[PDB]
Design a protein around this nucleic acid. Structure first.
Ligand SMILES: [Mg+2]
Ligand SMILES: [Mg+2]
Ligand SMILES: [Mg+2]
Ligand SMILES: [Mg+2]
Ligand SMILES: [Mg+2]
Ligand SMILES: [Mg+2]
Ligand SMILES: [Mg+2]
Ligand SMILES: [Mg+2]
Ligand SMILES: [Mg+2]
Ligand SMILES: [Mg+2]
Ligand SMILES: [Mg+2]
Ligand SMILES: [Mg+2]
Ligand SMILES: [Mg+2]
Ligand SMILES: [Mg+2]
Ligand SMILES: [Mg+2]
Ligand SMILES: [Mg+2]
Ligand SMILES: [Mg+2]
Ligand SMILES: [Mg+2]
Ligand SMILES: [Mg+2]
Ligand SMILES: [Mg+2]
Ligand SMILES: [Mg+2]
Ligand SMILES: [Mg+2]
Ligand SMILES: [Mg+2]
Ligand SMILES: [Mg+2]
Ligand SMILES: [Mg+2]
Ligand SMILES: [Mg+2]
Ligand SMILES: [Mg+2]
Ligand SMILES: [Mg+2]
Ligand SMILES: [Mg+2]
Ligand SMILES: [Mg+2]
Ligand SMILES: [Mg+2]
Ligand SMILES: [Mg+2]
Ligand SMILES: [Mg+2]
Ligand SMILES: [Mg+2]
Ligand SMILES: [Mg+2]
Ligand SMILES: [Mg+2]
Ligand SMILES: [Mg+2]
Ligand SMILES: [Mg+2]
Ligand SMILES: [Mg+2]
Ligand SMILES: [Mg+2]
Ligand SMILES: [Mg+2]
Ligand SMILES: [Mg+2]
Ligand SMILES: [Mg+2]
Ligand SMILES: [Mg+2]
Ligand SMILES: [Mg+2]
Ligand SMILES: [Mg+2]
Ligand SMILES: [Mg+2]
Ligand SMILES: [Mg+2]
Ligand SMILES: [Mg+2]
Ligand SMILES: [Mg+2]
Ligand SMILES: [Mg+2]
Ligand SMILES: [Mg+2]
Lengths: 48, 82, 60
RNA sequence: UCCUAAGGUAGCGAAAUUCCUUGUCGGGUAAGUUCCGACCCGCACGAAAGGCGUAACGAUUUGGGCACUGUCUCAACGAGAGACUCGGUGAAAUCAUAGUACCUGUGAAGAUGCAGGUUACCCGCGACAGGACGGAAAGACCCCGUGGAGCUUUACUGUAGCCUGAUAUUGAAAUUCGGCACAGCUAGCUGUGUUGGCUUUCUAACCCGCACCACUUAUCGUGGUGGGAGACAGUGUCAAGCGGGCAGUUUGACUGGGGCGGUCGCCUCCUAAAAGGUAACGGAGGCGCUCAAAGGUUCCCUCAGAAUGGUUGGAAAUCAUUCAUAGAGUGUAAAGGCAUAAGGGAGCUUGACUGCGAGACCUACAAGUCGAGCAGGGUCGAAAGACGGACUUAGUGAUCCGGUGGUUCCGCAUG
RNA sequence: UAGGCCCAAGCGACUGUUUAUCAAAAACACAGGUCUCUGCUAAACCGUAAGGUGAUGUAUAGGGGCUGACGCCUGCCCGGU
RNA sequence: GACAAUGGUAGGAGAGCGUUCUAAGGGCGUUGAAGCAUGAUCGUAAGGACAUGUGGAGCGCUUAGAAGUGAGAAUGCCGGUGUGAGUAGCGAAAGACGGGUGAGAAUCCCGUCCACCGAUUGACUAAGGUUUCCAGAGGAAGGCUCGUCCGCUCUGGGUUAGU
RNA sequence: UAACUUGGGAGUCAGAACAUGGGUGAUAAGGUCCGUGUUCGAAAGGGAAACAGCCCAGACCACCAGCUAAGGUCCCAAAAU
RNA sequence: GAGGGUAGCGGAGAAAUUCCAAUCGAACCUGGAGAUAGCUGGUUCUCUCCGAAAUAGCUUUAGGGCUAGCCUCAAGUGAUGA
RNA sequence: ACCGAUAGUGAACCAGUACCGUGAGGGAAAGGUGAAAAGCACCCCGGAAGGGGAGUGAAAUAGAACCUGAAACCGUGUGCUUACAAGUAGUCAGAGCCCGUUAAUGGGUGAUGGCGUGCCUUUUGUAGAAUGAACCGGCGAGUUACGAUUUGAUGCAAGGUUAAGCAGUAAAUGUGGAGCCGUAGCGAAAGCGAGUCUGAAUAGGGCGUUUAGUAUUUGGUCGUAGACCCGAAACCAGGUGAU
RNA sequence: ACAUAGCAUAUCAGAAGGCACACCCGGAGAACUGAAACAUCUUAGUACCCGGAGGAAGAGAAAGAAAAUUCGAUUCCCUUA
């Protein structure tokens, strides 16, 4: 509150809107796979 | 306890910063501002180009020198060599 | 009671360390110089984040 | 002669109103700023916010006499209550500690405390009032607070009430005056159907603080009977205008204290002390735009004046000749610049472009200007190059919200 | 123990009432004057309504302004609200 | 052994004593605990001890926790005691003497004399107040003095209605 | 012997007198307003008779030790009649 | 003199801002309620180290605030400071 | 790890009582003999109250105002000192006379000289004639919960971590992996990815990449709550009052 | 006039009032304050007032949530945040 002078968040303008469906993929990098073996599968039941 | 007269003017302009902004000898870079004026008090020389009636600014790298070449005129050059 | 952010932070995006405003003086007059209309990109906020870093805390 | 809706009549008038003012003149006293009578030169009397006069009346206001007196020049003495002395009983406001002198001076600018002098042995009772900025009330005067109250108004926004329409309760009948849908004829009329209104006319709703009868012996009330009004009112619902009657509220700051006058942002000098910066109610001026060419390019030319003569004569509206360094000109106010022109003409044209930008200067921030070079498309030029507005510095206004033109973007099961 | 008196002005006519506890007056009332509203469930108020005042009254009577006995008198303007 | 540094407000940064309670360990206490008073002692400060009196029953010391934790000012709050001070004031006014009571008398009781209101300081009724009414007894406190006395204390009593 | 970058914690936005360059005022102020230095504020001592702002100089504590600064040397009062 | 009525946005007023339980430009008593206060006063034990400002910009702002400036611990960079 | 009589409820005590108000409503003070009443038989002065002996009791210096008894303050004889003196009351020198210690470069008194204007708040500045305090006791002002960010600590390591509940000396330990944060960002978004975004561009830019985060807690500070205490006129509800 | 209001007897115990009004459910409902002023907003549907019950009242047996594969009355606790 700058004392009557309007604050910093009145001069700057607003822009954007978020979404209603902003599907957030759990971003697993490729480096993390260098720990296991047999090469069978990677799986949303196993990679958890 | 008598009503004194009204003043008339007050009313100054703000300011502008003028004069030299770099000095003779040091090492400048190809966008920097050498000197600036509301007119032409210092002409440009080699490797220094004018702006819009102001802001003599160095084209390329080097060190600066002040110099006269007439009886009154003065100019600024930059030599990249070292 | 939990710290209540105030929603003037629809106007700033946390970059990874610093804020990010959107540059002011957008609409309502363009009788204004042409290379200055070209300045329409955004800058990070200055070091007056001292005066506001208890207001925008949960945008993270 | 000019203007207004008209321009103050009667009667009073230096008055409870007369600033200049103790207006000038006459009574009263030897002496008269107040009083009494008249004058008009009414700053700024005046006809029901009343004018002018009036016998009686007032604890009224003002001036002048008589009777009378310690009110006074000028005080004196008597009587009583307290004060005073002794026996009885015995509070209060106040209070940093105190064995507490005066002068001149210094000091937060008026000293019991400090420097320098001077004068005073310790202790109490009776008085007086110059100090102790003595006590008594967190000064009422003044000024501040984005402090409250009460009052006012053609401040803003509202509201109790009051007036007028629509539609419900709410029914029948007629007269008309319409627009609209069709026919037929001479833009206009007949029938012809929707279809609003407009006047009336009834009668079952409703109302009658409207008389009679019963509950009952009772002015309320309920019920019937007869009357009068009548589809109006009264009532709800929605809509306009009225509305200080009543409520919450706002009414800026700067200021050699405050209201009054003037100011409030940008641009240019000076003050400003040879970098930049640098105030005051210090001194001087401007702006809230203008220009399709007064912008870009390629060429070429040099001025206002001073002389000297020459149809017209401005002293000076054209013409030549000569000496002219800028003494002219630059759309605009000033400073800094310009004769390589950045001034003046002549030919073409739109770079008064799109996407940008290394790096600087200024700066609390938001802003603010200057940018070499990079790509796409050009204009001018033979080419080298120049051009991303006018010789610079003024000519403008965050956000929010809304409008219009695009949009490869989201569009709450899917489209 | 029981009234000082007279002459002469200004504002009020008078008797009366008022700021308990600093103001008794030239203020307020008053009889009279006048304008305007009100036809009877009157307007005007109090109440949200029912009820009541007005009034068990009926324009020679009610509520509301402005002046303040009596005397002589109340001149001009309807542009504006 | 050197070598330098050490005035200080607003304010920033460290190291510290003491008070109350709990946990654990370890003690002192009728051969006298905590507080209270007095003393020439010890630590750089806040503070720590030790003898001697008074006191009659519950305290320290080390470690570590948790906080209602420290007093000189708020015209602070409450309770005490002073200064002013033996100072102002005793709340209108005519009393004097004799006798008696009494441990004590200008003040209480009896007498004479004197003065004071007398359209009232007189005699009655309602309004209020609620034992103040009367007798006997008492003297701490109340009465602006005194007291043997009282409208105050103690004990025991007192108000009668057909009109 | 400092400087700068980052991150926690503030306090100040009522200054004053001297010495000089200036505006305002009247070449008036212990006036007001800027520049620039010092000291006080936040600094005790010694001198200026006493005296926040002038002149010397910066107090960690002890001692009955010596030199010196500003001002002084007949007496009050240390030191040259 | 005795009974009675009118109650706070209200009542009464021969109008003065007078009266309404020693008062009143809107009574008192509770409760919202520890209202708010940019304003005064007050804030308690000790010692070491370092130690400022009274300015700039903008404000219904001038005795208030926010940022920069000036101090302080903690890390770094480390020759940039005089 | 709540108070121990100015605390704790206002109220330990024949408390919503005395007491103030017409009323609605305000609203106090005041605990302690000893183990047991053994509560002072008797003698004496005095009218009594009180008092000195005797007596009970470990103690009456424990006498029903009763344990302990501090300060202000009012008093009693005393060792030194004061009637020619100018004073924020001291301090530093130092004579004389009196007393002998937690035995140490000893304690009290002070004829006379230097030196010197109390304290706190507030200030450009104060002895200030600016404010505040009569004095002595007692009480009386940065606290807590929930969060956010920071350094200091301690577990684990590309991983860290439990909430509610359910069992259990109101045991702080067992289970519970719903969730949160972090390992990857960029853009308004679709979407893209070690890089995207604007953009015609592989040009130039802004923000990233190369790895340390996490859970609890001791500090410093913010936010919401009354949030360092004490103070206003004033507003709005609901009532009691015309004596 | 037919009956109804009305009127007269006999039975019945249904109600009224009070409550700790702590907690709950409906009716009606302010302002101080924050925004650095203030009117929309917020203090808050909070305090006061009134009505009705209970040992607990209200809600409640889908005209629901959801979008995948669906599971399923209401209430309450933790996260979503
Ligand atoms: Mg005369
Ligand atoms: Mg005359
Ligand atoms: Mg007339
Ligand atoms: Mg008239
Ligand atoms: Mg009279
Ligand atoms: Mg006397
Ligand atoms: Mg006497
Ligand atoms: Mg002087
Ligand atoms: Mg003097
Ligand atoms: Mg005397
Ligand atoms: Mg006297
Ligand atoms: Mg005052
Ligand atoms: Mg009828
Ligand atoms: Mg109003
Ligand atoms: Mg002002
Ligand atoms: Mg002035
Ligand atoms: Mg300069
Ligand atoms: Mg869809
Ligand atoms: Mg849909
Ligand atoms: Mg009269
Ligand atoms: Mg009149
Ligand atoms: Mg008249
Ligand atoms: Mg007309
Ligand atoms: Mg220090
Ligand atoms: Mg600290
Ligand atoms: Mg103890
Ligand atoms: Mg005290
Ligand atoms: Mg006092
Ligand atoms: Mg006397
Ligand atoms: Mg006798
Ligand atoms: Mg009686
Ligand atoms: Mg007596
Ligand atoms: Mg008796
Ligand atoms: Mg001067
Ligand atoms: Mg200066
Ligand atoms: Mg200094
Ligand atoms: Mg001296
Ligand atoms: Mg001397
Ligand atoms: Mg008045
Ligand atoms: Mg009256
Ligand atoms: Mg309060
Ligand atoms: Mg509140
Ligand atoms: Mg230092
Ligand atoms: Mg005690
Ligand atoms: Mg009692
Ligand atoms: Mg014995
Ligand atoms: Mg004693
Ligand atoms: Mg003297
Ligand atoms: Mg200060
Ligand atoms: Mg004094
Ligand atoms: Mg005082
Ligand atoms: Mg009466």
């Amino acid at each position: 509150f700058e004392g009557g002078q309007l604050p910093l968040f009145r001069r700057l303008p607003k822009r954007g809107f978020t979404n209603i469906n902003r599907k957030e993929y759990a971003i697993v990098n490729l480096d993390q796979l260098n720990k296991f073996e047999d090469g069978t599968e990677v799986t949303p039941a196993l990679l958890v | 306890k008598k009503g004194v007269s009204s003043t008339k003017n007050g009313r100054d302009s703000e300011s502008k910063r003028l004069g030299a902004k770099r000095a003779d000898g040091q090492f400048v870079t190809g966008g920097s501002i050498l000197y600036r004026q509301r007119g032409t008090k210092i002409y440009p020389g080699e490797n220094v180009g004018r702006g819009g009636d102001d802001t003599l600014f160095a084209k390329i790298d080097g060190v600066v020198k002040f110099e006269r070449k007439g009886r009154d005129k003065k100019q600024v050059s930059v030599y990249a060599v070292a | 009671p939990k710290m209540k952010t105030h929603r003037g932070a629809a106007k700033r995006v946390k970059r990874t360390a610093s804020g990010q405003l959107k540059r002011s003086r957008a609409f309502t007059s363009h009788l204004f110089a042409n290379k200055s209309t070209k300045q329409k990109r955004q800058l990070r906020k200055a070091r007056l984040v001292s005066k506001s870093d208890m207001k925008r805390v949960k945008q993270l």
